[PDB]
Every structure is written in structure tokens, then in C-alpha cells.
């Protein structure tokens, strides 16, 4: 809402400040032309420096949703949303997201009406085995990029208001500032759920004078 | 109810058994190769009867070619179609 | 109602809208000719050839200047006369559409009697009719009156008068 916030100047916050000066101050007509122009830079900073990395990033290589397989996306969801150290889904809503997406994979690649291999999202509490199960029944979904209907569905599961904001930026469009800034304060109390457990990705509120 | 349906110009004739025989053989040949008809299906014996009943010189030659040029080493199905085929040729030469 | 001869700004807008098969508002006034028909080199010189007959004298490089500018450049010499090309189009509009017996005379007399519009405004209603050609053939007298009704309102809205 354009209110000043005193944060510790981590790489993450220093990025935030740099995007305040160059991108989020621009008017609505100039925003999208500036994001498509600076795409490669923005993505390499989100991925290096920020607590919400660029979703579509497979083995360190920057992609887009449209150039990712259904497997690659399912695996990337489990990487960003499932905590290996605690062996649990950081939020039950993020599990619901990953299950909704594995059900969409079944729907797309099945030839006939059938039973879901994911009957309860409770099965995702071991998430590799649930992926290997779905993508062994539908081996075509390992070698095919997302249908354009499935990118639009995925992006509309990210805007779902009755769900904890996703820990990644899925696209660079008009809503980039809302993706970048929303639900920014929880990550400093829960560094297990941040990419490299790196505090320097996170936002820590803290006063200049009381820092002494 | 008593409204006429009949007209001579609507009579459809079907007499081209010379052509359907070759079709009926080739559909069998490939149905056996793809493993749709097995050696326990009665549909194979029904089909053999309907090919024998249309047996002429042209249809015999057509089988001789298709069966003599089957490679029996490509599968158990290609063996099964070569065996049955050779039998169907003898049967079609006998009832010519 | 007071008689006012037709503005060059209206006539021009109609002659351009008409020859692109496009509604009157679809084309904005503050835009060049060479923008609207940027593709086809033939339709450009055909619009310039038609404005050359309608008004008479033509400035230098008229397709690089907005219509708003060029409307005023024509307005000073233009004395509310339909001239050659617009007359020809209004004749064709009445003859190709319209029911039997509905001549331009009877369509003028109906705008006078009903909506009280004189010669100078009649012209302007007919130019608005020409921008909204119904692409059919008005079947009945009533259906045509209704059309001239709907064109009188659309003339009143653009000029700024009341009926």
C-alpha cells in the first residue's frame, strides 16, 4: 500500500528496495513492457536473492511455466512447499494445491473415466511416492510441456484467496508486485521453508536506533 | 399405415462377392497378426467358411502371395497366420 | 428549430467512415489517413481523390495530418454545400436501400414535418444515415421512418440540439 517499513538490509530486502526504485514506482501502462524487457534480470535476482524464487527453474536453469513438463512442475511444488527436515507440508493448503495439480495431470492424460490414484491428499504426506505413482500411470506427462489451459488453471490456483500465498513468483505480469510483496513476514520465524535456509533471502522488521 | 414405400429406383443390388472375398481374407490376415483373433476363437473358422464359399482362381492367387510372403520369424502371430493361411489355401483349392 | 449549414468536420468524418465500411465512432477524429489505411496504398489515394472532388482545393501532404486539423483547414472555404460526391452517395443510399416510393424528397419532407429539421440539418441527418447504411433494403415505409428517426437522434447527439 506504499507505507514505509524498516527492515534489515538483507540481499532480499535490498532487491525489494531496487524494485521499488525501478519497477513498482512505474505507472500501469509502462509496467508490463518493463517486466518483459528485464525478464532475464528480474528472474536471476528473484532466484539468487529473494525469499520467493522464480517457480519455473529446473536444475538452476530459468524456464517459464509453458516450457516445463507436468513432472517438472509437480517436483518443483514439492521442492518449494514440502520441508524435508521436518518431513511435512509447511501448510495444509499448499498440500491441497499440489494435490489439485496432480488430479489435473490425471484428468489431462487419461483416455477414459477412472479412479484418482490420489484418493486422499493425506497420501501426499509422502510426496515423492505420490508423484512417482501418478507419473508412472501417465508417462506421457513426463515428456510434454503444460497445456495452455493448465498454465491458466495453475496461475488461478495461485490467486486462490482461501489459501496461504505460494512461496514463489509464477509469472511476470501486472500482479508482479502483489506476488513479490504479499505474505513477507513469516519467513524469518521459519527459515526451514526458505530456499537454501538463507536468512539473507528474508525480510526481518527492525528499527535503526533500537539496533544499537 | 397403408402409405406406399416401394419404388423400383430405390432397389439396391449387392453382388460384388469377388471383391469382398479378398477384403475378408486381408481383414482376417491382419486380425490374426495383431492378435485380435487367436487359435481358440470360432470367428477364425466362421471366416474360413466364408472365404471357402467365395473361392475362385483370383482369391487363391491373392492368398498364395500374402501367405508365401509372410515372414514366420517376426512373431508367434506371423507363424500362426502362415500355418492357418497355408491350410486355408488347400481348403480353397479343394472347393474351387 | 434554427437552420445551420453542415460542418466540414461532420461531412469529412462521414466520407472517411463510409469508404472504410466502418461505423462513425469506430474511427477517432484525432488520427491521420495514413494511420487508418497504413497497409493498402490504393485505398489511401482513393480517399484523397474523393476529398479532392467533395471540397475542391486540397493542401500538401493531407494523409500525414490529423482529420481534426484538416477539418478546420477545409471549414473556412466550405459553405455547407453537399457538392458532387456526397450528393452522389446520398442518391445511391436512397435508391439502393429504401422501400418503393420513398424518394429523397419524401425523406426530406418527413424530417421537416416530424422532427422540424430544415434543409441544412436534413443534409446532416442524411449524412448520418449514410454512415449507418443498413445494408439491406428497408422493406416497409414504417421501417424507414424508424431508421430516419434513429438517425435524427444520432444527428442531435453529435451536433448537440434537442427534439
Amino acid at each position: 500500500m506504499g507505507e514505509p517499513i524498516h527492515k534489515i538490509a538483507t540481499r532480499g530486502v535490498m532487491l525489494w528496495k531496487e524494485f521499488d526504485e525501478t519497477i513498482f514506482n512505474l505507472p500501469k501502462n509502462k509496467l508490463v513492457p518493463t517486466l518483459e524487457a528485464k525478464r532475464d534480470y528480474i528472474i536471476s535476482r528473484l532466484n539468487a536473492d529473494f525469499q520467493k524464487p522464480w517457480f519455473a527453474t529446473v536444475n538452476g536453469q530459468a524456464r517459464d511455466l509453458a516450457t516445463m513438463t507436468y513432472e517438472e512442475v509437480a517436483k518443483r511444488l514439492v521442492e518449494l512447499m514440502f520441508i524435508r527436515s521436518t518431513n511435512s507440508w509447511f501448510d495444509v493448503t499448499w498440500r491441497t494445491f499440489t494435490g489439485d495439480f496432480l488430479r489435473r495431470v490425471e484428468e489431462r492424460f487419461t483416455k477414459s473415466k477412472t479412479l484418482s490414484l490420489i484418493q486422499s491428499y493425506s497420501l501426499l504426506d509422502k510426496p515423492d511416492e505420490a508423484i512417482e505413482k501418478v507419473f508412472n500411470a501417465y508417462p506421457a506427462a513426463r515428456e510434454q510441456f503444460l497445456n495452455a489451459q493448465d498454465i491458466d488453471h495453475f496461475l488461478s490456483m495461485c490467486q486462490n484467496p482461501m489459501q496461504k500465498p505460494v512461496p514463489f513468483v509464477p509469472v511476470l505480469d501486472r500482479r508482479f508486485e502483489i506476488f513479490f510483496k504479499k505474505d513477507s513476514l513469516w519467513q524469518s520465524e521459519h527459515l526451514e521453508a526458505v530456499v537454501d535456509q538463507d536468512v539473507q533471502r528474508t525480510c526481518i522488521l527492525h528499527g535503526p536506533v533500537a539496533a544499537q | 399405415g397403408v402409405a406406399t414405400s416401394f419404388s423400383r429406383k430405390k432397389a439396391r443390388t449387392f453382388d460384388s462377392s469377388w471383391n469382398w472375398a479378398k477384403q475378408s481374407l486381408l481383414s482376417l490376415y491382419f486380425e490374426i497378426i495383431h492378435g485380435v483373433l487367436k487359435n481358440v476363437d470360432r470367428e477364425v473358422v466362421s471366416e474360413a467358411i466364408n472365404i471357402m464359399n467365395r473361392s475362385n482362381d483370383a482369391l487363391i492367387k491373392f492368398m498364395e502371395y500374402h501367405i508365401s510372403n509372410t515372414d514366420e520369424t517376426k512373431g508367434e502371430n506371423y507363424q500362426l497366420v502362415k500355418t492357418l493361411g497355408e491350410q486355408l489355401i488347400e481348403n480353397c483349392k479343394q472347393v474351387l | 428549430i434554427a437552420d445551420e449549414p453542415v460542418k466540414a468536420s461532420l461531412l469529412l468524418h462521414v466520407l472517411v467512415a463510409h469508404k472504410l465500411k466502418k461505423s462513425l465512432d469506430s474511427i477517432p477524429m484525432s488520427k491521420t489517413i495514413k494511420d487508418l489505411v497504413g497497409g493498402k496504398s490504393t485505398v489511401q489515394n482513393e480517399i484523397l481523390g474523393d476529398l479532392g472532388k467533395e471540397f475542391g482545393t486540397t493542401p500538401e501532404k493531407p494523409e500525414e495530418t490529423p482529420l481534426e486539423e484538416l477539418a478546420e483547414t477545409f471549414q473556412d472555404t466550405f459553405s455547407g454545400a453537399l457538392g458532387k460526391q456526397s450528393s452522389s452517395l446520398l442518391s445511391r443510399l436512397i435508391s439502393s436501400k429504401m422501400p418503393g416510393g420513398f424518394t429523397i424528397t419524401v425523406a426530406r419532407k418527413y424530417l421537416q414535418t416530424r422532427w422540424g429539421l430544415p434543409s441544412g440539418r436534413q443534409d446532416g441527418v442524411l449524412l448520418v444515415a449514410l454512415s449507418n447504411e443498413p445494408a439491406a433494403r428497408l422493406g416497409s415505409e414504417a421501417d424507414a421512418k424508424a431508421f430516419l428517426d434513429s438517425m435524427a437522434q444520432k444527428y442531435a447527439s453529435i451536433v448537440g440540439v434537442d427534439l
Partner: protein, 97 residues
């Protein structure tokens, strides 16, 4: 099989005119527009279902079904007899099943 032929004709067995016309077609020469056959069997299995029609409900449908399943089978056999006896055919009877 070899030598077999199947002529398919639209036909209403409820129509007397259809019955006469169908047999005239079968017996007429190929030049006149016919088949130039001579029936060796007639299997008139045409029928319509009459369901929940007791004595008191006997009406139009049953009077029509009686025409299809009796009266016109007799007219079909008549028409065959009249065609064969016009051609002097006394040695090749049609078998009516």
C-alpha cells in the same frame, strides 16, 4: 458367397399396391426395369408388435397388423401365382414358409 445376390427394396407389407408392385418388379424382365427372376421361396416374416391389446381395445393398429400378417400375405401368394401362370410356369413352384 459366390453366385449370391442381395436386392434390398423399401417395402410396406400393409400396402396392397406395394405387394402387387414388388412382385411385378421381381418377375418383369431386366429390359422393362425388373430383375427377371422367378421365386423359388417366399418367407413372409413381416409383423408388428400388438402389446396390451385385449378384445375391447381391438382398433386401427390391430386391423392394420392383421392386414400385414394375413390378408396381404394371401395377396403376395396371389400375385406370385398370377405372374407364374401368365408365363406358363407349371413346373417350378415357389415354397411359401
Amino acid at each position: 458367397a459366390k453366385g449370391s445376390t442381395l436386392i434390398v427394396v423399401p417395402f410396406n407389407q400393409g400396402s396392397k399396391q406395394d405387394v402387387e408392385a414388388l412382385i411385378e418388379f421381381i418377375y418383369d424382365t431386366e429390359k422393362n426395369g425388373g430383375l427377371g427372376w422367378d421365386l423359388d421361396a417366399i418367407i413372409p416374416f413381416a409383423a408388428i408388435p400388438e402389446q396390451g391389446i385385449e378384445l375391447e381395445h381391438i382398433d386401427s393398429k390391430s386391423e392394420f397388423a392383421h392386414r400385414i400378417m394375413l390378408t396381404n400375405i394371401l395377396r403376395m401368394m396371389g400375385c406370385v401365382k398370377k405372374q407364374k401362370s401368365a408365363r406358363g410356369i407349371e413346373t417350378r413352384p415357389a415354397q411359401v414358409i
